[PDB]
Amino acid sequence: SMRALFITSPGLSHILPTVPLAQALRALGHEVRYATGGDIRAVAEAGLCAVDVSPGVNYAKLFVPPMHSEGLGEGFFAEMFARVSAVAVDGALRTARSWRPDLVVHTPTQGAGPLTAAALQLPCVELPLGPADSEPGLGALIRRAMSKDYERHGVTGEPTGSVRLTTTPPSVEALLPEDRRSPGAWPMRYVPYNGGAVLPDWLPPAAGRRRIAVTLGSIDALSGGIAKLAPLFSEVADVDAEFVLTLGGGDLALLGELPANVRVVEWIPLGALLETCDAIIHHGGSGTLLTALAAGVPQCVIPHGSYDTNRDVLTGLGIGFDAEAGSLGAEQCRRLLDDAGLREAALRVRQEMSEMPPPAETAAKLVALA
Amino acid sequence: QSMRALFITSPGLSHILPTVPLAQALRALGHEVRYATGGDIRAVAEAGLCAVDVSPGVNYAKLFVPPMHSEGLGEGFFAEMFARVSAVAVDGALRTARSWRPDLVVHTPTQGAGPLTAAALQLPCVELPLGPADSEPGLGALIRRAMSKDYERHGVTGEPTGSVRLTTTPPSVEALLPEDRRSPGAWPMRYVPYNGGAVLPDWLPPAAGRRRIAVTLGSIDALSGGIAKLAPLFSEVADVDAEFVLTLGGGDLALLGELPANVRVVEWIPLGALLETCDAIIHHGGSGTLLTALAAGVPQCVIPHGSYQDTNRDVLTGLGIGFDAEAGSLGAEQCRRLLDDAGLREAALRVRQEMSEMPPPAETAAKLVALAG
Ligand SMILES: O=c1ccn([C@H]2C[C@H](O)[C@@H](COP(=O)(O)OP(=O)(O)O)O2)c(=O)[nH]1
């Protein structure tokens, strides 16, 4: 059996899209082990095995410890990701030494991954969460910022191999800026993984009754973001459709009673939901976006520029459109459900995604590389 | 279009678990997997997969159980029993199949709702057994008969289109089974342990030159005054130059009473992960435990039930990978035998090699996609 060590960022959304691959390898009769922290339990809930490389560590404190200030760039974030990776290094190394992998899989911001691969002279595989996760020269910079961590464990090497995986289909890829394109990367089909579930009664869709998923995302929902959707839900009663709202932690009490045609659930796997849905309104999460694409379903994105890159994609491909929360209502919903061009394009991209090699295939490719 | 696979399984944990690799494999190929079961259903969810509860609220214990002169003290009794248990899944299985529209039904041998559903919708079905034990002759054919009333009600007059039988049993083990328990023409699939996912503990990585023996009674059998069995063993293990790892699986710890220093206790830990770091295993004769141990290429000691005459003794003996031992007479002697007897290890290793030559679940999944597609 080949042995694959998955060294990931502690965050749920970085972990989840690695599961298909891990799962795929186990399916080939090989061995998979994770080496992470934070939202590690998600690995266990996926039928896989994980080692906690940073027990007790408070990540929040770690992440967070200008007119004139320099270094308002990638360097700030590289530094930040280095501090977070730092607390995984020792753990990752002990595990790698005892468990002895043939291959390191890592996520782009997890600096412990290439460090470990370099230390043990193994190849590494970069597995990104999606299009957003393609910050230019991020990896090289994280490495630099971790110099002190490399030098302490006596690591002068570069890992053996450096494969980059991509789950982004070619047409989406084309619409990204040149410096965010990853050419020569191994394409792998995006296979939604959102968690396993005992599915509810109501999931199977009623006869001739259309359905719109509304998702806040696992993150922005707890900020106080449910408020955002108040205008929407003040007009949905007028819409000849069923709405499914996933809270993902958000406070219901912020708006309270919703119309009869709105169903509320805390969590449900997105892939499973969209299988039965006609359209989706969301926040612009990468995982949510790719999942929706995969489902071949029109999309509406409530943008928000605290920082997105997802406007030009939906527009460019013609699978969807953007809409400000304050001006979001029945009309957008109608457009989602009736606009033929949105559906065909959605379907078009889905087809493209299904032509990309599945994770099973990608796994076979790696097994030999190791 | 993804191919769609409906997994209709027995409500029991141990029947569910060995189906995961396959399901998992299909997802990996970019296809769709959905389970349709009850009872220990939440294990499906914890495996990263999706499930429909076909029998919510149902009390299974009441279902399973409500000499010299009675009659039919045979397979017919168990067929009838399995029919009653399957019965409560039928309606659910059918609704799901109708709405979800699978291309392929995957079932476990005692789950009668599986072939019923495959027959009703004229789909092929795939039998996936838990291991060698799960090969009662003509069990399926008899469950069907006992479920006649269930078939006739949903107006099912026909047979599923296809009937593929999977086997995770390696050829050498297969040869040592009685003829009527052999499944020839069955598609071989590599046994890939699946026991559940875990956040693995500190101590799992094994110390330098320190040998380790796993002791386990399983997910069941350790319950309700069954841990007592191992009291003689733990009264002698202190003498053994090795580390012992005991998995409680619900058993009352206090019953063993006093433990030596060289014994570590954990409630639960995935068996595959444990045995990777172990030199040998003492167990109860669990079918998933046995194949896992084989896969680990590891000598085995088995504790028999006095209630039923399993076939496991002859396999272990026949292959020379292990031996049997009564709980009352189980001690340091056997442990030493496990760790030092060269023949046990080589044989164990030999069978492991054989298992690794069988097609993995990924390959088997591909084969099915063609069968249904
Ligand atoms: O601590 C434990 C206890 C049980 N198991 C798993 C191993 C095995 O795959 C399953 C049960 O084994 P079985 O003998 O097939 O089932 P039963 O208990 O029904 O005999 O539970 C573990 O992984 N760790």
PDB file of C-alpha atoms and ligand atoms in Angstrom, chain B residues 13-15 17-18 130 191 193-196 215-221 246-249 266-274 283-290 292 305 308, ligand 1:
ATOM      1  CA  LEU B  13     -23.663  -1.763  12.078  1.00  0.00           C
ATOM      2  CA  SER B  14     -21.534  -4.781  10.999  1.00  0.00           C
ATOM      3  CA  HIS B  15     -23.557  -5.302   7.800  1.00  0.00           C
ATOM      4  CA  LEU B  17     -19.551  -0.973   7.534  1.00  0.00           C
ATOM      5  CA  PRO B  18     -18.107  -3.333   4.869  1.00  0.00           C
ATOM      6  CA  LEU B 130     -19.743  -8.898   5.364  1.00  0.00           C
ATOM      7  CA  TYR B 191     -11.290  -6.475   1.449  1.00  0.00           C
ATOM      8  CA  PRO B 193     -11.040  -2.439   6.286  1.00  0.00           C
ATOM      9  CA  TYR B 194     -13.519   0.190   7.279  1.00  0.00           C
ATOM     10  CA  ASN B 195     -14.262   0.632  10.955  1.00  0.00           C
ATOM     11  CA  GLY B 196     -15.114   4.302  11.196  1.00  0.00           C
ATOM     12  CA  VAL B 215      -7.488  -7.639  22.324  1.00  0.00           C
ATOM     13  CA  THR B 216     -11.077  -7.151  21.130  1.00  0.00           C
ATOM     14  CA  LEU B 217     -14.601  -8.586  21.627  1.00  0.00           C
ATOM     15  CA  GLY B 218     -16.233  -6.280  19.063  1.00  0.00           C
ATOM     16  CA  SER B 219     -19.043  -3.726  18.789  1.00  0.00           C
ATOM     17  CA  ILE B 220     -21.254  -6.396  20.274  1.00  0.00           C
ATOM     18  CA  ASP B 221     -20.510  -9.355  22.579  1.00  0.00           C
ATOM     19  CA  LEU B 246      -7.916  -3.607  24.904  1.00  0.00           C
ATOM     20  CA  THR B 247     -10.949  -2.198  23.133  1.00  0.00           C
ATOM     21  CA  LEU B 248     -14.026  -2.194  25.414  1.00  0.00           C
ATOM     22  CA  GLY B 249     -16.734  -1.588  22.796  1.00  0.00           C
ATOM     23  CA  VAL B 266      -9.594   2.427  25.078  1.00  0.00           C
ATOM     24  CA  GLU B 267     -13.348   2.485  24.524  1.00  0.00           C
ATOM     25  CA  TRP B 268     -13.125   2.466  20.748  1.00  0.00           C
ATOM     26  CA  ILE B 269     -10.453   2.729  18.040  1.00  0.00           C
ATOM     27  CA  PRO B 270     -10.568   1.807  14.347  1.00  0.00           C
ATOM     28  CA  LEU B 271      -9.336  -1.773  14.066  1.00  0.00           C
ATOM     29  CA  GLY B 272      -7.396  -1.262  10.832  1.00  0.00           C
ATOM     30  CA  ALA B 273      -5.480   1.638  12.350  1.00  0.00           C
ATOM     31  CA  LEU B 274      -4.788  -0.397  15.504  1.00  0.00           C
ATOM     32  CA  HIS B 283     -10.619 -11.844  19.431  1.00  0.00           C
ATOM     33  CA  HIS B 284     -14.159 -13.212  19.526  1.00  0.00           C
ATOM     34  CA  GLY B 285     -14.468 -14.394  15.935  1.00  0.00           C
ATOM     35  CA  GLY B 286     -16.028 -11.317  14.398  1.00  0.00           C
ATOM     36  CA  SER B 287     -16.244 -11.562  10.601  1.00  0.00           C
ATOM     37  CA  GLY B 288     -15.011  -7.994  10.093  1.00  0.00           C
ATOM     38  CA  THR B 289     -12.407  -8.513  12.805  1.00  0.00           C
ATOM     39  CA  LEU B 290     -11.125 -11.666  11.079  1.00  0.00           C
ATOM     40  CA  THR B 292      -9.200  -7.009   8.977  1.00  0.00           C
ATOM     41  CA  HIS B 305     -19.006 -18.843  21.263  1.00  0.00           C
ATOM     42  CA  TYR B 308     -22.921 -21.620  17.720  1.00  0.00           C
TER      43      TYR B 308
HETATM   44  O1  LIG C   1     -12.745  -0.912  19.312  1.00  0.00           O
HETATM   45  C1  LIG C   1     -13.241  -1.318  18.238  1.00  0.00           C
HETATM   46  C2  LIG C   1     -14.320  -2.210  18.257  1.00  0.00           C
HETATM   47  C3  LIG C   1     -14.858  -2.640  17.044  1.00  0.00           C
HETATM   48  N1  LIG C   1     -14.330  -2.198  15.890  1.00  0.00           N
HETATM   49  C4  LIG C   1     -14.855  -2.616  14.591  1.00  0.00           C
HETATM   50  C5  LIG C   1     -13.958  -3.673  13.948  1.00  0.00           C
HETATM   51  C6  LIG C   1     -14.933  -4.528  13.173  1.00  0.00           C
HETATM   52  O2  LIG C   1     -14.816  -4.221  11.773  1.00  0.00           O
HETATM   53  C7  LIG C   1     -16.325  -4.184  13.698  1.00  0.00           C
HETATM   54  C8  LIG C   1     -17.081  -5.357  14.317  1.00  0.00           C
HETATM   55  O3  LIG C   1     -16.456  -6.601  14.001  1.00  0.00           O
HETATM   56  P1  LIG C   1     -17.331  -7.877  13.566  1.00  0.00           P
HETATM   57  O4  LIG C   1     -16.721  -9.031  14.308  1.00  0.00           O
HETATM   58  O5  LIG C   1     -17.416  -7.919  12.062  1.00  0.00           O
HETATM   59  O6  LIG C   1     -18.818  -7.532  14.129  1.00  0.00           O
HETATM   60  P2  LIG C   1     -19.616  -8.228  15.365  1.00  0.00           P
HETATM   61  O7  LIG C   1     -19.247  -7.349  16.550  1.00  0.00           O
HETATM   62  O8  LIG C   1     -21.062  -8.086  14.937  1.00  0.00           O
HETATM   63  O9  LIG C   1     -19.162  -9.674  15.427  1.00  0.00           O
HETATM   64  O10 LIG C   1     -16.164  -3.173  14.691  1.00  0.00           O
HETATM   65  C9  LIG C   1     -13.243  -1.292  15.895  1.00  0.00           C
HETATM   66  O11 LIG C   1     -12.759  -0.879  14.807  1.00  0.00           O
HETATM   67  N2  LIG C   1     -12.732  -0.883  17.066  1.00  0.00           N
END
